[PDB]
């Protein structure tokens, strides 16, 4: 008995009660905030488009990047008209700039060094139009990640469950987080799958030198959608 | 991070609400009932102990019949004194009598016909005393069974959590029950398996006619500990 992935994480954090809509929106207005004529927005790492979705209706010209090609069919099929790319937030050229760069939920966290950071930070600042801003959502930070951490939650949405429990041991200077998916679907059949997630912990100061050297200032928000914060950049 | 299957199924029916000791002292008292004066029971396929650590304070002579040597070894573990005996509930021969012959939580669902049913309850009788009573807790019944059933449960007991998911859907006259378990302990890792049960769905009429040839009057009561009900046979 076969079950897509891309699809389990999204009935999944959909029936969890992440809240793709309102994250939006605040981001938005985040984004207004300090670019208040904001017109374009690029989502970077935008994995299915959900966000992506709400930010097309907010800003109406916007494009979304991502590395894999999996997300990217995921997010066609929900958008068939977006502006979608293939890439590495590391180093893409999209020939092209945008009023608002933004990456949420700790995509960057994916980055493996400092270097890669600042890689991928210069890179948003690319894209950047003159006024522009950078909404980053961080992975947990060193000293704020909490080892050993046992996630397990039961959702049923759609007719379908879906159980998953996740555990959280530091590995080095990252996040070693393996995942369980048990799916069912009554009459149907049950499967089950693993994936297992290596999330740098770097720390905030790391962050903000990223922003720094990609001529950005930068300032920290405590919160943010998941409780990891935002980092929120404007050309320096 | 290895995680020793029966404890895992131990736990997760503690944590779950399953009350052994209530159930226990009910059944004693059912017990009774029917035998007053009731001294010896067998508690038949005991799994790892459980009803039979409190049969014991209930009456004293207590023995229990497993064909499983990993059941037998954590009954034992349970209680290092318990008279524990291996073999099949279709044909084991202990020599003696008891007051009381029992099989909870639907072990003879185990059995694949009605043949084997009826060779099984033919033992019960053989090693009943005279002014006895036997008690079986049955499997659902083709008239009951509720197809396509999915349970999904998430329990959190001395720190260990385990997520479980079963999907159930008939095959023949049987449940064919495919169960997923998760369990993780912080810090220690985390660990999936699943196991397939075929239990039989013996009509109700063809549990009775398993008593009645083995020469007991028998009573259908409805409910049980399982919600499965319960049959209670004496000596006709
Ligand atoms: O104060 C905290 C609380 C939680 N965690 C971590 O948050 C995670 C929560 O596990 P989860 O499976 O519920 O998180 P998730 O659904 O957000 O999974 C991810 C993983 C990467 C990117 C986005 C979501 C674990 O790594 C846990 O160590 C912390 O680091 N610090
Ligand atoms: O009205 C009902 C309600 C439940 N069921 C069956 O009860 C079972 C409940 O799934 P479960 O995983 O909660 O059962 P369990 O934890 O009691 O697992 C077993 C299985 C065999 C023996 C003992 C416990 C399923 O097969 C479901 O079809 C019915 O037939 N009819
Ligand atoms: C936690 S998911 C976030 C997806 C989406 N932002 C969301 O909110 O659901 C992390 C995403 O980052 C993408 N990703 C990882 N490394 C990347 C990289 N170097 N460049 C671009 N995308 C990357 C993954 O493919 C995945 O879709
Ligand atoms: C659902 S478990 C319940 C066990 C226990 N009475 C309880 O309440 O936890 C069913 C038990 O039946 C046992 N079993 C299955 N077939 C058997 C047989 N032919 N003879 C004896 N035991 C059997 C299995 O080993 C298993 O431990």
Same mark, same amino acid.
């Given at each position: 008995?076969?079950?897509?992935? !891309?699809?389990?994480?999204? /009935?999944?954090?959909?029936? *969890?009660?992440?809240?793709? =809509?309102?994250?939006?929106?605040?981001? !938005?207005?985040?984004?207004?905030?300090?670019? #208040?004529?904001?017109?374009? /927005? $690029?989502?970077?790492?935008?994995?299915?488009?959900?966000?992506?979705?709400?930010?097309?209706?907010?800003?109406?010209?916007?494009?979304? $990047?991502?590395?894999?090609?999996?997300? $990217?069919?995921?997010?066609?099929? *929900?958008?068939?008209?977006?502006?979608?790319?293939?890439?590495?937030?590391?180093?893409?050229? $999209?020939?092209?700039?945008?009023?608002?760069? @933004?990456?949420?939920?700790?995509?960057?966290?994916?980055?493996?060094?400092?270097?890669? /950071?600042?890689?991928?930070?210069?890179?948003?600042? +690319?894209?950047?139009? #003159?006024?522009?801003?950078?909404? @980053?959502?961080?992975?947990?930070?060193?000293?704020?990640? =909490?080892?050993?951490?046992?996630?397990?939650?039961?959702?049923?949405?759609?007719?379908?469950?879906?159980?998953?429990?996740?555990?959280?041991?530091?590995?080095?200077?990252?996040?070693?987080?393996?995942?369980?998916?048990?799916?069912?679907?009554?009459?149907?059949?049950?499967?089950?799958?693993?994936?297992?997630?290596?999330?740098?912990?770097?720390?905030?100061?790391?962050?903000? =030198?990223?922003?720094?050297?990609?001529?950005?200032?930068? +300032?920290?928000?405590?919160?943010?959608?998941?409780?990891?914060? /935002?980092?929120?950049?404007?050309?320096?």
């Amino acid at each position: 008995y076969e079950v897509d992935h !891309a699809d389990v994480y999204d /009935l999944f954090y959909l029936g *969890r009660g992440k809240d793709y =809509a309102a994250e939006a929106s605040d981001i !938005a207005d985040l984004v207004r905030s300090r670019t #208040p004529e904001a017109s374009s /927005l $690029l989502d970077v790492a935008c994995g299915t488009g959900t966000h992506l979705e709400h930010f097309t209706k907010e800003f109406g010209d916007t494009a979304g $990047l991502e590395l894999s090609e999996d997300m $990217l069919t995921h997010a066609r099929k *929900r958008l068939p008209d977006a502006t979608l790319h293939q890439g590495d937030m590391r180093d893409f050229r $999209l020939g092209r700039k945008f009023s608002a760069v @933004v990456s949420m939920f700790s995509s960057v966290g994916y980055l493996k060094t400092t270097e890669e /950071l600042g890689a991928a930070v210069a890179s948003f600042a +690319e894209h950047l139009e #003159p006024g522009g801003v950078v909404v @980053v959502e961080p992975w947990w930070f060193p000293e704020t990640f =909490a080892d050993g951490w046992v996630s397990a939650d039961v959702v049923r949405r759609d007719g379908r469950t879906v159980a998953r429990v996740s555990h959280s041991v530091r590995e080095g200077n990252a996040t070693r987080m393996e995942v369980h998916f048990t799916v069912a679907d009554p009459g149907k059949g049950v499967r089950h799958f693993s994936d297992v997630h290596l999330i740098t912990l770097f720390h905030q100061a790391e962050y903000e =030198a990223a922003f720094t050297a990609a001529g950005l200032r930068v +300032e920290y928000l405590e919160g943010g959608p998941s409780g990891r914060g /935002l980092f929120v950049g404007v050309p320096a």
